[PDB]
Amino acid sequence: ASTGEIAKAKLDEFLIYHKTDAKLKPFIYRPKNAQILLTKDIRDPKTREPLQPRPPVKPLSKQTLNDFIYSVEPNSTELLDWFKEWTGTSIRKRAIWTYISPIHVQKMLTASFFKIGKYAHMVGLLYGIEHKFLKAQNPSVFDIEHFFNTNIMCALHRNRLKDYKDAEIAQRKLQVAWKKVLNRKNNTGLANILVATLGRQIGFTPELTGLQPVDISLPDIPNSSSGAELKDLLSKYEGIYLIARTLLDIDQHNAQYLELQEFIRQYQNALSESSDPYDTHLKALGLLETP
Amino acid sequence: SAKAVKFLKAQRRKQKNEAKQATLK
Amino acid sequence: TCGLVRIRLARFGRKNSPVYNIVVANSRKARDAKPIEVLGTYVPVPSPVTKRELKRGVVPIKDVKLDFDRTKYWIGVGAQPSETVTKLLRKAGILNDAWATSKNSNVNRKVVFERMETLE
Amino acid sequence: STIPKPSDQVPDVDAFLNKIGRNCNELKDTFENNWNNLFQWDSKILKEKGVNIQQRKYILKQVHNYRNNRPIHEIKLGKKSFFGGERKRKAFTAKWKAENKQ
RNA sequence: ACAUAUUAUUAUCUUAUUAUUUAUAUAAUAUUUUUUAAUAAAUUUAUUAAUUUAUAUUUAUUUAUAUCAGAAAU
RNA sequence: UGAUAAGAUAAUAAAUAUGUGGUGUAAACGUGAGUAAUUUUAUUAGGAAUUAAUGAACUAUAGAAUAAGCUAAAUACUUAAUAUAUAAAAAGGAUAUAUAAUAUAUUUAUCUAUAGUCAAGCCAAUAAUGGUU
């Protein structure tokens, strides 16, 4: 019924298809074999009724998981349970282990912190399962523009919301985060700004190997106002809008950089007609803090 | 039948040889 | 013991008085079935020494009859001795310490008498 | 042979009788926590003390292991499969698959 | 006479199973092959479901021969 | 490691043989129904077709052990690669050490080839109870 409910059904059908046995796939999903399936009377696992034909499964849309992520209730384990079931699949199922994109992990980390309120257990499922992704030939998901930056951004908010000021825990956690990055391709340059802001906030001097200086290269959405092309473009650059607004709000040193404010102007004025992503998230963090 | 056609083929062969013995004797 | 050709003891004699043939046998045949060859005999009961002999220093002797040459041939073609036969062959000097195991390895035990080959 | 020395894992006879297992902890009163008795009593003495055939042989094997610095951890006796011995497995399995899963 | 039991045999009848050998499929699977939608990714390609195409491997039915056994006769 | 503890990783110590795998039951044991011999027994210094790319499983020696798929995973299974007209293969595990998963070392297994050992197939000659009512 709801967008979340529909997305979950699509995501659960996709997994059931790719977890089905290869010998039995042609007889359970090709509608021309419905009568051959009946005759064989294969018995559904769990000693249930014999298996029945299912509608053929087609490649799933990457937007399907973005809809489910933002439907999870304010305090729920649904996102943490889906990920644990999805990433428990064999690494031989390429369709399952290549569906996850860098955008999905960013949206799983930003939703968990500001909406679902289970960030700690979402950063442990990702840290724990990173080894399987490498074995499954999908290391790109753990990058600097979607995984590292989103993590440091959520840290710059938890360290404030919670007041954490230890200069040893922060550095240790920052080192682990950088060690968890498998696709180190700094492009926007916001990573260096985010790392420097963390050091000022927690009174330490960051020093990570391989994070070479990169000048800001914020993607500028054009003044042209399209429809689904600009709704996708904004949603595409939604993560870096949450990082630009975060950088300025946490520390006023980032106000020095004028590239950050241009993107705010462009991304905000691009669809200022609609609501604000940054503010909408922070409200929920307060609605979750109160509990 | 296949067994009735084999029987007759053999019966004719045996009778040809029994006659052969009489022609030789 | 492994392999298809094994050197092992086949039991003869009577109840409570066992004697053995040293035989080369197919692994799958019965213990007392007619073997490939009978290499020798083993009498497990030591010869009793008299009171005087004991003080005199005589040690009880277990008697083994064995075809040394034929035994070496069967070891050469890969026949596998049983544990008891292995002990007998090591004491005869046919096999060496390479056939010893960790449980019976007498690495540190004093030798009171050295193996002596004589003619009689 | 000679009397080995108590260790930290096996401080006394009671600890020795518990590590080896096979219900040998039920002989703690036969030995009376005397270290020397465990390492001097042979089969004949143990038989006179009421230790049954299987246990006394098992103790003597573990006493020899201890004397030689070999592990004395309990090794369990074999047990038949859950579905029974091989000769009665086909019948048992057939009657267990018609009363559990139908 | 005969009523019984047992066995054997067959130009006969019926026949499980199996082997071998026929014909057939809009049969299944894989690959190839002709196209066709849906979906997805990227900005043509992939996937799935169909269709066409041959190929191999199976399946169902079917033709013929032999066959446990039983029936009848001796 | 995970800013709160759900999980992940490694080391260590245990558990599991109601999941997938391996090896083992062509032997041994028992019996004498059938079997009078195209088949069974016994014997011979017997034989050829002038007996397989058979090793069954130990010995000696030499070499090899590759890539995918399928299963939850594998020393399971499947399809390929390369190896004596040429054909025909495989498998890792344990423990250390050094590295950034890989490499060596040790240990135990896998595959192939050659010979040995054990062990097979087939044939001949001669003999093997009673009744010709």
Ligand SMILES: [K+]
């Ligand atoms: K009997």
Ligand SMILES: [K+]
């Ligand atoms: K008989």
Ligand SMILES: [K+]
């Ligand atoms: K090895």
Ligand SMILES: [Mg+2]
């Ligand atoms: Mg062995």
Ligand SMILES: [Mg+2]
């Ligand atoms: Mg018949």
Ligand SMILES: [Mg+2]
């Ligand atoms: Mg099992």
Ligand SMILES: [Mg+2]
């Ligand atoms: Mg037999």
Ligand SMILES: [Mg+2]
């Ligand atoms: Mg390999």
Ligand SMILES: [Mg+2]
């Ligand atoms: Mg594999």
Ligand SMILES: [Mg+2]
């Ligand atoms: Mg295999």
Ligand SMILES: [Mg+2]
């Ligand atoms: Mg192959």
Ligand SMILES: [Mg+2]
């Ligand atoms: Mg008469």
